[PDB]
Amino acid sequence: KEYHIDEEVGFALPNPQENLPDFYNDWMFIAKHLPDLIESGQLRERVEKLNMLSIDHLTDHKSQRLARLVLGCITMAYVWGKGHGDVRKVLPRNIAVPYCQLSKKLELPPILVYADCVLANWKKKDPNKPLTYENMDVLFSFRDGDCSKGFFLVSLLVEIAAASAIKVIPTVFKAMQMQERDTLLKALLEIASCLEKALQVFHQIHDHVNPKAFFSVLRIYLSGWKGNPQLSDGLVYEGFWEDPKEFAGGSAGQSSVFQCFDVLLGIQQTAGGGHAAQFLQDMRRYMPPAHRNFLCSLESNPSVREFVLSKGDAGLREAYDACVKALVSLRSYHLQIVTKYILIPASQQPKLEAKGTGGTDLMNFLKTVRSTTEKSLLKEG
Ligand code: HEM
Numbered sequence: 001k002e003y004h005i006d007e008e009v010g011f012a013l014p015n016p017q018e019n020l021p022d023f024y025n026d027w028m029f030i031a032k033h034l035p036d037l038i039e040s041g042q043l044r045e046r047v048e049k050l051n052m053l054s055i056d057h058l059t060d061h062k063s064q065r066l067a068r069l070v071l072g073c074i075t076m077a078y079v080w081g082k083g084h085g086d087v088r089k090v091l092p093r094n095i096a097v098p099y100c101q102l103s104k105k106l107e108l109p110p111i112l113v114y115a116d117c118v119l120a121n122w123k124k125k126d127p128n129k130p131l132t133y134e135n136m137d138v139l140f141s142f143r144d145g146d147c148s149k150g151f152f153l154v155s156l157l158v159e160i161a162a163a164s165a166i167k168v169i170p171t172v173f174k175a176m177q178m179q180e181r182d183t184l185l186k187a188l189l190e191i192a193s194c195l196e197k198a199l200q201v202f203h204q205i206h207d208h209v210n211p212k213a214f215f216s217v218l219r220i221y222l223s224g225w226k227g228n229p230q231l232s233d234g235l236v237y238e239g240f241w242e243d244p245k246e247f248a249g250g251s252a253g254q255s256s257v258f259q260c261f262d263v264l265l266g267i268q269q270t271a272g273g274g275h276a277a278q279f280l281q282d283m284r285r286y287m288p289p290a291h292r293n294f295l296c297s298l299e300s301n302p303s304v305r306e307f308v309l310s311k312g313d314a315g316l317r318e319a320y321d322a323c324v325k326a327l328v329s330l331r332s333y334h335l336q337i338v339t340k341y342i343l344i345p346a347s348q349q350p351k352l353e354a355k356g357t358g359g360t361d362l363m364n365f366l367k368t369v370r371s372t373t374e375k376s377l378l379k380e381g
Pocket residue numbers: 151154155156158159205209214250251252253255258331334337338341342355356357358359360361362365366369
């Protein structure tokens with residue numbers, strides 16, 4: 001079965017739509033000139049003075065996902081505004097109704113998710129040149145000097161690097177079924193190599209994303225309205241819903257690729273009934289329908305951990321541990337990123353636990369997730 005996985009990019013949208021049809025030019029002009037409109041402070045006036053447009057004219061899947069990115073970026077720009085404190089609790093019917101109808105059609109929440117701002121928000125400058133940062137550029141930004149290009153593309157490049165292991169997954173379960181030791185050993189080491197390579201692509205974040213520019217500018221526009229003191233009851237969608245509704249902000253916890261390795265290796269991140277387990281499970285509803293199907297498809301298969309444990313095979317245990325060590329390394333490095341990009345900039349701000357964009361007590365959350373990964377290390381059985 002097909003889960004919209006590409007051979008070249010993985011779970012990213014393969015060469016996404018760059019521009020909407022002529023009927024939706026009113027939405028496109030607002031989203032493209034978004035840094036200018038916020039800085040002037042005239043964004044909120046133009047969204048209110050807009051016409052309610054029907055979503056029927058959107059032809060294909062690539063167009064529909066771009067429209068989610070267009071309307072999603074505008075919604076975040078309308079709510080947070082300049083990003084200082086003054087917020088809009090109400091989203092006008094002219095934008096709220098078409099966005100909710102598109103969200104329901106694509107089985108996604110009416111909020112900017114990872115699939116919009118990362119997986120669909122990219123273009124390559126030269127089509128003949130291979131996929132690299134210097135050849136790539138984002139489609140939409142929130143502000144000037146907010147490091148949108150560096151942040152969204154590095155996240156995408158790590159996604160693509162790790163997605164090289166997705167093609168190895170069919171080999172893993174076939175080797176278990178056919179009872180093929182040498183094949184499974186080579187397959188697991190290949191996955192471990194991909195995750196080690198993804199860590200090297202991660203290093204690029206320091207070059208292209210500024211710590212102060214991320215925290216005080218860009219981070220506010222990725223934040224949502226679930227477990228948020230600024231929008232306590234949430235957001236009222238005028239015309240569509242009767243009561244204010246809570247929805248979580250964007251995170252890479254909404255990525256299928258990164259959740260899939262925990263599932264493949266039998267790292268029970270979603271089990272336990274804890275706050276960390278609850279978040280990662282809830283974020284699957286913030287993923288595309290096809291990507292959600294892939295995750296439980298992996299859960300439906302025999303456990304790789306249980307297979308390797310029963311064998312009494314030092315080489316097969318080592319190859320399995322190589323994957324787990326690679327995931328620990330990525331999560332240890334991610335926490336170092338958190339120190340540089342959240343923790344240190346937060347202490348520099350002028351006049352109790354810190355919360356992420358997704359809506360978690362981040363330091364306790366991320367360490368629990370890493371601890372669960374560390375516990376999965378076999379260490380000679
Ligand atoms: C600007 C740099 C980054 C910061 C400050 C950051 C911070 C965080 C925070 C606070 C969370 C907790 C969830 C939430 O409340 O939002 C989180 C989760 C996560 N981040 Fe990041 N992150 C960054 C970049 C990345 C990148 C580039 C990746 C990989 C492409 C990544 C992968 C993840 C994953 C997979 C999770 C879910 C928890 C887990 O499985 O470990 N992050 N991040």
